[PDB]
PDB file of C-alpha atoms in Angstrom:
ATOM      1  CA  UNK A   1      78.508  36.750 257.577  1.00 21.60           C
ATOM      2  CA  UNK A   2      80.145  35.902 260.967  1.00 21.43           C
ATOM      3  CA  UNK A   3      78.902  38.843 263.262  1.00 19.95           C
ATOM      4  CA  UNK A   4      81.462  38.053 266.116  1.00 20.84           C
ATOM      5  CA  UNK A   5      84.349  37.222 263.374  1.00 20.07           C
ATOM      6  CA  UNK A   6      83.721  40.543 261.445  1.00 19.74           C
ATOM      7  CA  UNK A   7      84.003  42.388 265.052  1.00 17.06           C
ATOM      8  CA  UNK A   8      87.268  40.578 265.950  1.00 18.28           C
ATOM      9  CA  UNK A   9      88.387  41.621 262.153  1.00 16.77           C
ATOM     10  CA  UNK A  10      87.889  45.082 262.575  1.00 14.76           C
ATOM     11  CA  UNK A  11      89.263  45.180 266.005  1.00 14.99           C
ATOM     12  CA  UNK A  12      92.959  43.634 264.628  1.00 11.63           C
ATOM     13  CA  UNK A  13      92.685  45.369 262.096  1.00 11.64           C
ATOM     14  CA  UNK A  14      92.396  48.798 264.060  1.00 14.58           C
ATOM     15  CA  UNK A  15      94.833  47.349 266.511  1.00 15.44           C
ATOM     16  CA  UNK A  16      97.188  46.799 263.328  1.00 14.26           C
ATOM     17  CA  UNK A  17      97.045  49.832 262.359  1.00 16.92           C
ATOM     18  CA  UNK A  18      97.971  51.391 265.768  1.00 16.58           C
ATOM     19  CA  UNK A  19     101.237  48.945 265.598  1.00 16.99           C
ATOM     20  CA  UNK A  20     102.313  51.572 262.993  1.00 17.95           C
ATOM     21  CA  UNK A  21     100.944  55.103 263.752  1.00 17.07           C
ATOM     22  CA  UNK A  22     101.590  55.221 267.409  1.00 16.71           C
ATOM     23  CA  UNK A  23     104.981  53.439 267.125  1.00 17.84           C
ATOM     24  CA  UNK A  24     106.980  56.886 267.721  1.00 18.05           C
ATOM     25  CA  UNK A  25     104.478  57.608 270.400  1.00 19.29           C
ATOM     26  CA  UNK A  26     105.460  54.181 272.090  1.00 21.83           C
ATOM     27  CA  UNK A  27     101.746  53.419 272.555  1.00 25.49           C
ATOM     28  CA  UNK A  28     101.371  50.283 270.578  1.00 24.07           C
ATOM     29  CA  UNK A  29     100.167  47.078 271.165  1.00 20.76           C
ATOM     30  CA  UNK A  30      97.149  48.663 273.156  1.00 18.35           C
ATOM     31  CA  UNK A  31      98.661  51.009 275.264  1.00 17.67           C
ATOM     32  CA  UNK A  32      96.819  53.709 274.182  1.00 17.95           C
ATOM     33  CA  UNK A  33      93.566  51.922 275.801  1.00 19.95           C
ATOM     34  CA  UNK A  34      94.913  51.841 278.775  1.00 19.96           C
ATOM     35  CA  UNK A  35      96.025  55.456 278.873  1.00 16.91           C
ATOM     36  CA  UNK A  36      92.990  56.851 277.572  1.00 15.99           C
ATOM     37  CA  UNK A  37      91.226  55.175 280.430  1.00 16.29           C
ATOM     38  CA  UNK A  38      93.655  56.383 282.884  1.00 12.89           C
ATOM     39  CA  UNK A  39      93.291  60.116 281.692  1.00 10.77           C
ATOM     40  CA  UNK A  40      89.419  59.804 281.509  1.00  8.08           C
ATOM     41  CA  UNK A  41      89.670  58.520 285.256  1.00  8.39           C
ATOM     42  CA  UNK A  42      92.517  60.413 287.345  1.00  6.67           C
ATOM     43  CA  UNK A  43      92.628  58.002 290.377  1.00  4.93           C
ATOM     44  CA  UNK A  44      91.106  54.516 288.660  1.00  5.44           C
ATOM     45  CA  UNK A  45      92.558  51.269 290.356  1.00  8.11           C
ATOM     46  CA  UNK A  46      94.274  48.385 287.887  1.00  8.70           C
ATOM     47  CA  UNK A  47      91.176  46.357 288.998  1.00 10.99           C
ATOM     48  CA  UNK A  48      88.465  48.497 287.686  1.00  9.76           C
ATOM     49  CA  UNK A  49      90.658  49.397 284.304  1.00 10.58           C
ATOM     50  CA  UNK A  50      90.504  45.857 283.516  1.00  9.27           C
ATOM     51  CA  UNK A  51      86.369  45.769 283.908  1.00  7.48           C
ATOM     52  CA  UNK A  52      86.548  48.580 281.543  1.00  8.10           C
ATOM     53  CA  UNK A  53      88.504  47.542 278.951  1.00 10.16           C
ATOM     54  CA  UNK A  54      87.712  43.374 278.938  1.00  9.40           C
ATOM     55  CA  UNK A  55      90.864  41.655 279.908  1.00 11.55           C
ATOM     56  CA  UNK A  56      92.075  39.868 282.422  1.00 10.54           C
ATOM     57  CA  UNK A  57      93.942  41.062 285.409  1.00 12.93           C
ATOM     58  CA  UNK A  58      97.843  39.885 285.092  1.00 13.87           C
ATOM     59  CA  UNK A  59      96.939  41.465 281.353  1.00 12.83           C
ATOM     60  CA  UNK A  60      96.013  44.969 282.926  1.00 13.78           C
ATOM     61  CA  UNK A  61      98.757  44.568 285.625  1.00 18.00           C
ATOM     62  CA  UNK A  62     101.689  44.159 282.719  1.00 16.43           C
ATOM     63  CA  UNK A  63     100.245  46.960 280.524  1.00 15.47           C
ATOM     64  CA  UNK A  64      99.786  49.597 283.408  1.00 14.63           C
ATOM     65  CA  UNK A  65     103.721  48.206 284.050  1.00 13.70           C
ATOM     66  CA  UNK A  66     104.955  49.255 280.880  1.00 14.10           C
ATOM     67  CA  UNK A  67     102.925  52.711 281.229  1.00 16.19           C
ATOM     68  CA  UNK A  68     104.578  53.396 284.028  1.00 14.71           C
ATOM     69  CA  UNK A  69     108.353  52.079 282.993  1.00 13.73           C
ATOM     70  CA  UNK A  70     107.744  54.256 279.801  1.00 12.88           C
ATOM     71  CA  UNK A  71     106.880  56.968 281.607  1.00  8.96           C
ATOM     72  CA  UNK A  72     103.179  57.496 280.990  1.00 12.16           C
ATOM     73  CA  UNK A  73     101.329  56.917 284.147  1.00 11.16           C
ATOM     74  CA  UNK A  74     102.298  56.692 288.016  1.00 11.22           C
ATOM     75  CA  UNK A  75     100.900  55.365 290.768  1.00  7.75           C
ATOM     76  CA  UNK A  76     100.284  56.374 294.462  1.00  7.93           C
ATOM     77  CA  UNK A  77      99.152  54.183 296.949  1.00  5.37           C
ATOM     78  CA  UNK A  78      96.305  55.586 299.538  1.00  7.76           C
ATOM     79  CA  UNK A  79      97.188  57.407 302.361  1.00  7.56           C
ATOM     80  CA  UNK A  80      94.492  55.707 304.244  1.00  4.74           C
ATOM     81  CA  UNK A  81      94.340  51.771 302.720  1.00  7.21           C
ATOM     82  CA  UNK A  82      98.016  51.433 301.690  1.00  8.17           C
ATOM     83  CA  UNK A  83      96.498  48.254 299.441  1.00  6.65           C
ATOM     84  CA  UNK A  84      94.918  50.900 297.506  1.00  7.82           C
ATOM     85  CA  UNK A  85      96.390  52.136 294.417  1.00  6.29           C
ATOM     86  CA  UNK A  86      95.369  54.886 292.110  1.00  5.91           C
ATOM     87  CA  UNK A  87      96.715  55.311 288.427  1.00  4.88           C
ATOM     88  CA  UNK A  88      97.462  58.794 287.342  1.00  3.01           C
ATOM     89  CA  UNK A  89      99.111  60.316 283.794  1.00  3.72           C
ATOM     90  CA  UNK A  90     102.246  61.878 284.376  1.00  3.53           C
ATOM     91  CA  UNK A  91     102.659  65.397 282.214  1.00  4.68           C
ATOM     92  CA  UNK A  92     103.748  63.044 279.473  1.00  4.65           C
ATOM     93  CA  UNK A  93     100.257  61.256 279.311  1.00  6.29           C
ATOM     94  CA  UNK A  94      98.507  64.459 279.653  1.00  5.61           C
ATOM     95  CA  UNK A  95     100.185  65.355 276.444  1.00  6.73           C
ATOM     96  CA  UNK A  96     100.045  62.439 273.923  1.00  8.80           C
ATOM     97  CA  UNK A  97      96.501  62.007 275.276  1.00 10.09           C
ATOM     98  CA  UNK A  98      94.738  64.338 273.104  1.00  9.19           C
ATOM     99  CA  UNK A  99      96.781  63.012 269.923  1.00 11.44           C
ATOM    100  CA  UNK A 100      95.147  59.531 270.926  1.00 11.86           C
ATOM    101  CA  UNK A 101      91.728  61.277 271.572  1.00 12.87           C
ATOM    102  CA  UNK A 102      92.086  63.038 268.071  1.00  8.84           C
ATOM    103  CA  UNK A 103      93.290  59.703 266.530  1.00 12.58           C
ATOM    104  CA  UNK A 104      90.345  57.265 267.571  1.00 14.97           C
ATOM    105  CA  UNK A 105      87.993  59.841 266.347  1.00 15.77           C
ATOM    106  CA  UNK A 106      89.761  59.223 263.039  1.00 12.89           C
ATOM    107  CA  UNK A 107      89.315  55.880 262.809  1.00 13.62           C
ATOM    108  CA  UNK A 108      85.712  56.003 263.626  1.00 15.29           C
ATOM    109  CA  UNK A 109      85.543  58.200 260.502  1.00 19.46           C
ATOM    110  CA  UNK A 110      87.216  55.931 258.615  1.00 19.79           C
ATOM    111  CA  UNK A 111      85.286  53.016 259.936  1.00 20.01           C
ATOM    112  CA  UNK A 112      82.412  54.356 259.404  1.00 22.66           C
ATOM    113  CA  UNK A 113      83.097  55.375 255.841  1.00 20.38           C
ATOM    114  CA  UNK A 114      79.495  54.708 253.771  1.00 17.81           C
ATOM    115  CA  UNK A 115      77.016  54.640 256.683  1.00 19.19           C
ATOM    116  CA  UNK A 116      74.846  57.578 257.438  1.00 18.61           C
ATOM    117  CA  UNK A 117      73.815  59.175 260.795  1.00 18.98           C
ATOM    118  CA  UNK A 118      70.474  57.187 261.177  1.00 19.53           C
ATOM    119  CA  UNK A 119      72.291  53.925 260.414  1.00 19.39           C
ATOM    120  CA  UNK A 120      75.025  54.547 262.433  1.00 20.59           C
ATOM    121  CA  UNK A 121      72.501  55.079 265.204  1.00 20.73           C
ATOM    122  CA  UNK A 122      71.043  51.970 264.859  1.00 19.03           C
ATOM    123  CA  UNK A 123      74.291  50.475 264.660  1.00 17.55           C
ATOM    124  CA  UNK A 124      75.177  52.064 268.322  1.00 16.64           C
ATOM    125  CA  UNK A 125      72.197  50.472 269.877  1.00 16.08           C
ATOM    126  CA  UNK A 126      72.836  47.173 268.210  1.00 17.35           C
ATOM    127  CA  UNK A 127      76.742  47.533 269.750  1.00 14.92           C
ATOM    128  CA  UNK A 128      75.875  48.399 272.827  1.00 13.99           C
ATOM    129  CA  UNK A 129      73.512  45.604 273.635  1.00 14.08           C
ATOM    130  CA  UNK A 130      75.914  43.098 272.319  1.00 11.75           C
ATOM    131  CA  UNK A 131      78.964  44.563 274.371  1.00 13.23           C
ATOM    132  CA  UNK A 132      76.117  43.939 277.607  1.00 11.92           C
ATOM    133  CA  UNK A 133      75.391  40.741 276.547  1.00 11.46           C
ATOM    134  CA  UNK A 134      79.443  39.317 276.123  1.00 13.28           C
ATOM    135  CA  UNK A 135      80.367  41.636 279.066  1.00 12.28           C
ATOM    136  CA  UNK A 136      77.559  39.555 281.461  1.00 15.04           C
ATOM    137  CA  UNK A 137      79.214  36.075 279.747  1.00 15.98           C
ATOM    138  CA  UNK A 138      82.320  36.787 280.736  1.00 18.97           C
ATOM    139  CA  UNK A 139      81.573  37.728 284.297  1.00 19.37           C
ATOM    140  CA  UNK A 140      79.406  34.410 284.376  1.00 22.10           C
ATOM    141  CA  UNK A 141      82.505  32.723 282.878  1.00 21.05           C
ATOM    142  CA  UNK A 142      85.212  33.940 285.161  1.00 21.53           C
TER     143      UNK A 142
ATOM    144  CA  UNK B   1      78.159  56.260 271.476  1.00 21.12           C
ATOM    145  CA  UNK B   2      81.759  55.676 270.298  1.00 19.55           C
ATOM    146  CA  UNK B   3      80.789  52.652 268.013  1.00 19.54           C
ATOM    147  CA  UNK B   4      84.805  51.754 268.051  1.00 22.66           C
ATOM    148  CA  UNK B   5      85.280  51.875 271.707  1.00 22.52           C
ATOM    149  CA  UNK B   6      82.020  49.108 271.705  1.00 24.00           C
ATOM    150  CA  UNK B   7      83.849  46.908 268.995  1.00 22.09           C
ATOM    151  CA  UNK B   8      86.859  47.328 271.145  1.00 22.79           C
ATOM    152  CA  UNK B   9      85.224  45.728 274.404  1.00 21.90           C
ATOM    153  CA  UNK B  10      83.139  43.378 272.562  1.00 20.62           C
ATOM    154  CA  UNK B  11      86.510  41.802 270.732  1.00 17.52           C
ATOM    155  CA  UNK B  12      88.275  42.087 274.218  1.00 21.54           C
ATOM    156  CA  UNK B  13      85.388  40.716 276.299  1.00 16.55           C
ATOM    157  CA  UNK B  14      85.310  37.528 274.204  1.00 16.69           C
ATOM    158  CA  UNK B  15      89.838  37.119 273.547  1.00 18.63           C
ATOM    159  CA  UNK B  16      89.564  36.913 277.881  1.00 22.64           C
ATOM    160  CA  UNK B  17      86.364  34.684 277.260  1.00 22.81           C
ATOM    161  CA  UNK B  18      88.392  32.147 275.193  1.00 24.11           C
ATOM    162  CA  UNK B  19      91.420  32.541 277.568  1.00 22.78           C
ATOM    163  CA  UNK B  20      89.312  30.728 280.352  1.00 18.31           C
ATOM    164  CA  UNK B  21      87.419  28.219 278.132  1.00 16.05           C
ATOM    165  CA  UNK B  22      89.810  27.390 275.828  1.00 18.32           C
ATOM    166  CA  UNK B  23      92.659  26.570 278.717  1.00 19.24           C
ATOM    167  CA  UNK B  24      92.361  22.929 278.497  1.00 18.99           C
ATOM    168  CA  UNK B  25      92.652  22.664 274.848  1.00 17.16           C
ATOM    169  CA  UNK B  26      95.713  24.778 274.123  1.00 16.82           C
ATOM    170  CA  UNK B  27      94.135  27.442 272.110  1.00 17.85           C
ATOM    171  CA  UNK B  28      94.091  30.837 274.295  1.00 15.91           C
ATOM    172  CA  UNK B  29      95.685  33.979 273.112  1.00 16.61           C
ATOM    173  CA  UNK B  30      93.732  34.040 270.205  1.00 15.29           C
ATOM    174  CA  UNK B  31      95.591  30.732 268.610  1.00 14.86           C
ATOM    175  CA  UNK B  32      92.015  29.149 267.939  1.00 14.82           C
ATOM    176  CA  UNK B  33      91.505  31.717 265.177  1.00 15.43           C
ATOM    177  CA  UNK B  34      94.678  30.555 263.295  1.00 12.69           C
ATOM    178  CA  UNK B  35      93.930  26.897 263.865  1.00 12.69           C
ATOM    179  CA  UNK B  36      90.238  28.089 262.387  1.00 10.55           C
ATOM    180  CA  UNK B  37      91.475  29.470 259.168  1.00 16.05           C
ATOM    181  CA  UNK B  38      93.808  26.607 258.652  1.00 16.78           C
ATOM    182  CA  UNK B  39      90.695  24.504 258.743  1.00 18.09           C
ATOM    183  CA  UNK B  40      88.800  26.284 256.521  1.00 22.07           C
ATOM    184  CA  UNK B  41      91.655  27.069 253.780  1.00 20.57           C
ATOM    185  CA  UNK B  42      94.045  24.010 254.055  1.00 22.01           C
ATOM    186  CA  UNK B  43      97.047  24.796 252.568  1.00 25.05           C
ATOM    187  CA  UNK B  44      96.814  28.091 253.237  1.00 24.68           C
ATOM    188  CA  UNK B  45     100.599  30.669 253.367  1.00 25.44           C
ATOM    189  CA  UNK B  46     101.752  32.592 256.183  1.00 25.65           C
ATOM    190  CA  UNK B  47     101.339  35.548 254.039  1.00 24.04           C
ATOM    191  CA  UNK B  48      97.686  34.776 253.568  1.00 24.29           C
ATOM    192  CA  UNK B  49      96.684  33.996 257.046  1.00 24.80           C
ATOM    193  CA  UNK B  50      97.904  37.224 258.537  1.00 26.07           C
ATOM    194  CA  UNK B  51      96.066  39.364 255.558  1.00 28.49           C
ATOM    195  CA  UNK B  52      92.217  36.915 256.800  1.00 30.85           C
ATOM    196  CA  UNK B  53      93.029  37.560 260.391  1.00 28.77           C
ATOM    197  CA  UNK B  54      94.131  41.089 260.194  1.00 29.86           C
ATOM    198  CA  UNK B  55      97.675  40.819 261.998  1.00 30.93           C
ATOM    199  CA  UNK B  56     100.775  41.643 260.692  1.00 30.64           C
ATOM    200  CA  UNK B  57     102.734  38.732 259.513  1.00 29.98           C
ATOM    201  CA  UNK B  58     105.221  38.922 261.967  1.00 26.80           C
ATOM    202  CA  UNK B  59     102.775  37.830 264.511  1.00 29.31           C
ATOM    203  CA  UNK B  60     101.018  35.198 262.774  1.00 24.17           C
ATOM    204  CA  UNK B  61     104.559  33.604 262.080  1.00 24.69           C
ATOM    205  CA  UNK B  62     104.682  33.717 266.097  1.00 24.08           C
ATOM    206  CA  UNK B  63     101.488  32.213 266.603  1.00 23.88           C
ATOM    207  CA  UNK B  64     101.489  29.688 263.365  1.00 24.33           C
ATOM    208  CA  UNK B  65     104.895  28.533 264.654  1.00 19.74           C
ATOM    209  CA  UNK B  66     103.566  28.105 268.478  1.00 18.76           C
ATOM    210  CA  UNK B  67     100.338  26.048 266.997  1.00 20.75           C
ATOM    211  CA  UNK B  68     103.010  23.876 265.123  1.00 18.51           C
ATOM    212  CA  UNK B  69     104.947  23.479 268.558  1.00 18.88           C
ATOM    213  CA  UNK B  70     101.737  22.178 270.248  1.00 17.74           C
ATOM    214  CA  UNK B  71     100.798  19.711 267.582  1.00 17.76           C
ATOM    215  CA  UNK B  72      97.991  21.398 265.945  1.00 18.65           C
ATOM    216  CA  UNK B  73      99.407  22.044 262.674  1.00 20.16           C
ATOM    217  CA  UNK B  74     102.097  21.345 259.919  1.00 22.50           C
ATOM    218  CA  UNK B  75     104.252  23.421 257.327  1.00 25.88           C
ATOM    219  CA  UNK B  76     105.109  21.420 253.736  1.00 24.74           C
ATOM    220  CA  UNK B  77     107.840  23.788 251.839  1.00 28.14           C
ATOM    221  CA  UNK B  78     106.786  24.401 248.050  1.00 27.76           C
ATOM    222  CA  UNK B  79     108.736  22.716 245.706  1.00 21.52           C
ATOM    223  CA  UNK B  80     109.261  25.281 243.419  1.00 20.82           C
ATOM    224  CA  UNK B  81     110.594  27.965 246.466  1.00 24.05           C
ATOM    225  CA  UNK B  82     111.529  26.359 249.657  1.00 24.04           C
ATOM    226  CA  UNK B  83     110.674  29.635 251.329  1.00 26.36           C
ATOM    227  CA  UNK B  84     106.835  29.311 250.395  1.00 27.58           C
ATOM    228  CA  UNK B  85     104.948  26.753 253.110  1.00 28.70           C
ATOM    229  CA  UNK B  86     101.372  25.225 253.458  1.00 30.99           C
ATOM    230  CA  UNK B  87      99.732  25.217 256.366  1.00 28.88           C
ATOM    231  CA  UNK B  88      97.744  22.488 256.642  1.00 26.57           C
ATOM    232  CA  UNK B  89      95.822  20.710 260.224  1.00 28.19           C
ATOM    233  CA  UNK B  90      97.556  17.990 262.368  1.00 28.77           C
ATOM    234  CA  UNK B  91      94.931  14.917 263.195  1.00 30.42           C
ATOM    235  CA  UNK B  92      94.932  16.666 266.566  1.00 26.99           C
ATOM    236  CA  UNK B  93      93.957  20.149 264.623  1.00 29.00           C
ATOM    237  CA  UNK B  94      91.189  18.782 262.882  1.00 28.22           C
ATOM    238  CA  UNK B  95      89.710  16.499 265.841  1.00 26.74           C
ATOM    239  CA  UNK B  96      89.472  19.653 267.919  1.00 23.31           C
ATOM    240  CA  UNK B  97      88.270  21.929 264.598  1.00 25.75           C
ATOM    241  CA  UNK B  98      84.975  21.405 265.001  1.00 29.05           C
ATOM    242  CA  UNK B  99      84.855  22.242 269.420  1.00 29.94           C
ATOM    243  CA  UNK B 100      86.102  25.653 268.475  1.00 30.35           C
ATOM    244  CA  UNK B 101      83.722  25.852 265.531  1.00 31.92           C
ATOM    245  CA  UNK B 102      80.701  25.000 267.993  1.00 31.89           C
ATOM    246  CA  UNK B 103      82.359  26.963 270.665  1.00 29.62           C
ATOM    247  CA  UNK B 104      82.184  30.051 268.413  1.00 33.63           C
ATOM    248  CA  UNK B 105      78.160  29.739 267.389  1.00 30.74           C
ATOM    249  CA  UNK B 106      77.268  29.695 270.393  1.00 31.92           C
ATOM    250  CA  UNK B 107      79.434  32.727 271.530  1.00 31.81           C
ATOM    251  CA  UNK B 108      77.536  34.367 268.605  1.00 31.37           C
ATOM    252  CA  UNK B 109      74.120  33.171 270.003  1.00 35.77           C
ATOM    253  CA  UNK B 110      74.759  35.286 273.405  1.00 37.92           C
ATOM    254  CA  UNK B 111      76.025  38.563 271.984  1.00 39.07           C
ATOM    255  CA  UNK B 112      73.195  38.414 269.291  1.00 35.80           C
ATOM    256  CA  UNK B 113      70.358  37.698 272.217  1.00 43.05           C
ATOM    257  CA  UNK B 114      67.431  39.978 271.875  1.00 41.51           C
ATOM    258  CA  UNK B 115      67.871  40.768 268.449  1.00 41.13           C
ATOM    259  CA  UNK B 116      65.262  39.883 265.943  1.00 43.03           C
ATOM    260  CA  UNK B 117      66.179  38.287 262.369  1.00 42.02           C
ATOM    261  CA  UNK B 118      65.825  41.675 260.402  1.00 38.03           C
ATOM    262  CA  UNK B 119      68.153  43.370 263.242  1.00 36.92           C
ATOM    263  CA  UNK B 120      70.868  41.036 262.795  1.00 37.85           C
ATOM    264  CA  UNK B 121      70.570  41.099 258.962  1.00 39.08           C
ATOM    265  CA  UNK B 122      70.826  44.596 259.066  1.00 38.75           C
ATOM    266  CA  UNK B 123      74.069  44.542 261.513  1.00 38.12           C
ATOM    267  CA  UNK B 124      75.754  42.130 260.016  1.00 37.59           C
ATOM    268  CA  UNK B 125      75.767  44.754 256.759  1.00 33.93           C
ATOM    269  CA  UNK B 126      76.910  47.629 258.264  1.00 31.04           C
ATOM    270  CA  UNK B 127      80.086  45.095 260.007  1.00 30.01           C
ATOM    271  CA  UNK B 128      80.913  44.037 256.325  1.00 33.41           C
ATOM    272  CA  UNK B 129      81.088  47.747 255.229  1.00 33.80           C
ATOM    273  CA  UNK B 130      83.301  48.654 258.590  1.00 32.86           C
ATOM    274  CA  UNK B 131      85.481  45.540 258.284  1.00 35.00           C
ATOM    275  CA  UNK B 132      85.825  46.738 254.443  1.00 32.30           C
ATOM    276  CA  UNK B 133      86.687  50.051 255.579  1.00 33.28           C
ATOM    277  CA  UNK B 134      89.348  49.702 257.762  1.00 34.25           C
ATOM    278  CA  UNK B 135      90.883  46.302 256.167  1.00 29.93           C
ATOM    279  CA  UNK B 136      91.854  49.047 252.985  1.00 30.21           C
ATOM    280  CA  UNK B 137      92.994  51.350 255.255  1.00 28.80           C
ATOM    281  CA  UNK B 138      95.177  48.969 256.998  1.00 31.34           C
ATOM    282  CA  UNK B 139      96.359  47.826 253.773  1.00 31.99           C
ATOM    283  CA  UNK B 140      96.911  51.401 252.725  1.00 34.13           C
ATOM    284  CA  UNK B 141      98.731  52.153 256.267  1.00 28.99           C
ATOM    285  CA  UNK B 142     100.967  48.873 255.374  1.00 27.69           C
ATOM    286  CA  UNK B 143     102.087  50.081 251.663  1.00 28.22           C
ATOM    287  CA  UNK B 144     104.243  52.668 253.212  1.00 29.42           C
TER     288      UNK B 144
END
């Protein structure tokens, strides 16, 4: 098969799928990423949530947006450098979060539906050396 | 290691990847994977390219009607139900086919480098099980 198609597959797929469950958690079309990242890093900047989860800048910049609009996340520029600033959930984020946290490990189990603990281990190595490899390319691209 | 969180950045890493390289040709935000399947199945329905790509149809409408808006494609109602239409590639589609299709190998070659033959064999399994797996569930979610 197509390694790199079957990965994009199961990515829609998963991002499908979120479309409909998180819909009256207004958390769809990847929102959830980006507040998972924000509550697994109080005080993260929009530039280093991108690195983490692959996309481009203006992409980050409109999701954080919408976070904040739907009352998710806030933001507080630094005392010190105002150009500075940090992403924080808001009690609402705090709250959803571990629904989201709960949720993804769901879908792992569901993923990984048929594969045991020593294949799925060699399938985590394998994963992880191809998300260094593409995540190198795309520095060297941009 | 979250194995979904890597699939996650992997499919991420290389949508921004194609965003840069595939500028000049008109195919970013993921449009060179419809303009793909409608090279490999010509003829193929809405309906059908939405269930390969793993989108809802709603958004494949969005992004079959965009590729027809930049040239790349074309829509031929059914006879039989004037509501049913073929996708099928433009000249321009099909000339720039066959880029994307290189494009893509060699996309493959750098996220596969360092793994042996057997490796990759063995990888390439456990994605057809995972892709199985949530495909039916997505299906499932769907048949609400």
């Amino acid at each position: 098969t197509d390694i790199l198609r079957e990965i994009g597959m199961i990515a829609r797929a998963l991002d499908s799928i979120s479309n409909i469950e998180f819909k009256e958690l207004s958390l769809t079309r990847g929102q959830y990423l980006y507040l998972v990242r924000v509550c697994e890093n109080p005080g993260i900047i929009q530039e280093k949530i991108a690195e983490l989860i692959k996309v481009d800048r203006t992409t980050a910049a409109r999701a954080i947006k919408r976070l904040e609009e739907q009352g998710f996340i806030y933001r507080q520029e630094d005392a010190s450098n105002k150009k500075i600033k940090r992403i924080y959930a808001t009690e609402k984020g705090k709250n959803v979060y571990p629904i989201i946290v709960r949720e993804n490990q769901h879908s792992n189990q569901v993923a990984l539906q048929g594969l045991s603990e020593v294949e799925i281990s060699q399938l985590a190595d394998y994963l992880v050396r191809m998300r260094k490899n593409v995540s190198e390319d795309w520095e060297f691209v941009k």
